[PDB]
């Protein structure tokens, strides 16, 4: 099992969703990014497997669930199975973690993507050992009702270019972003 990665959209002031919708319109070329960053496995024989709460599950639509080409980890604790459409449950992050070195998931799975929502990345963020945050920022203020956690910048270093990452401006629907990778190792 390879590397552990967040990966995210938000806005100037934190937003990462209103009311289980993005807080902007549609960026196309955006949500190709995510999919490809997400999808992509350095390893072959092997998928990555993407880990999200149960909300960021059912923000996404029927028709596209579960994420092709990848493994779908859904937590929760209400929740007895996976839903419809989902590959595994797990109770909560540690645990889903631990599920990718058992029997079943250790030779199957290459990279570990958290893909939401903000309980999720708190966690994440401030458990010991490597990860990186591929953080795309929507450069204006959106209305929103969840948030992405603080990035401590003391432990979490902007990377100078990263491959596979354009570097530059990106502009859709007139909105300017740009794409981010972030490192710890603690
Ligand atoms: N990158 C972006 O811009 C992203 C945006 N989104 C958006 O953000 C918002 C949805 O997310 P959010 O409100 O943060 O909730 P999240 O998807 O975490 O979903 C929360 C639910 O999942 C369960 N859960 C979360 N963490 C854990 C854990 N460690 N263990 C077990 N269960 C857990 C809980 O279910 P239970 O109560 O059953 O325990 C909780 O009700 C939406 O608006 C969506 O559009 C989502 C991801 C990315
Ligand atoms: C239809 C699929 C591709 C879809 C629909 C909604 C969403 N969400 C919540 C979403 C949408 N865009 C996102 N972009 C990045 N950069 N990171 C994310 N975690 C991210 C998450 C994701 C995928």
Request: charged share 30%; net charge positive.
């Given at each position: 099992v390879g590397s552990l990665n967040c990966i995210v959209a938000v806005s100037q002031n934190m937003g990462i969703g209103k009311n289980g919708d993005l807080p902007w319109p549609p960026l196309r070329n955006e949500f190709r990014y995510f999919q490809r960053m997400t999808t992509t496995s350095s390893?072959?024989?092997?998928?990555?497997?993407?880990?999200?709460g149960k909300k960021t599950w059912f923000s996404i639509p029927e028709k596209n669930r579960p994420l092709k080409g990848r493994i779908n980890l859904v937590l929760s604790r209400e929740l007895?199975?996976?839903?419809?459409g989902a590959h595994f449950l797990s109770?909560?992050?540690d645990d889903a973690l631990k599920l990718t070195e058992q029997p079943e998931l250790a030779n199957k799975v290459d990279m570990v993507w958290i893909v939401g929502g903000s309980s999720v990345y708190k966690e994440a963020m401030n458990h010991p050992g490597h990860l990186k945050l591929f953080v795309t920022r929507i450069m204006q203020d959106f209305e929103s009702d969840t948030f992405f956690p603080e990035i401590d910048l003391e432990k979490?270093?902007?990377l100078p270019?990263?491959?596979g990452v354009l570097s530059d401006v990106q502009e859709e629907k007139?909105?300017?972003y740009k794409f981010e990778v972030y490192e710890k190792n603690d």
């Open positions: 390893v072959e024989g092997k998928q990555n497997l993407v880990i999200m007895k199975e996976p839903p419809q109770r909560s992050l979490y270093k902007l270019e990263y491959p007139g909105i300017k």
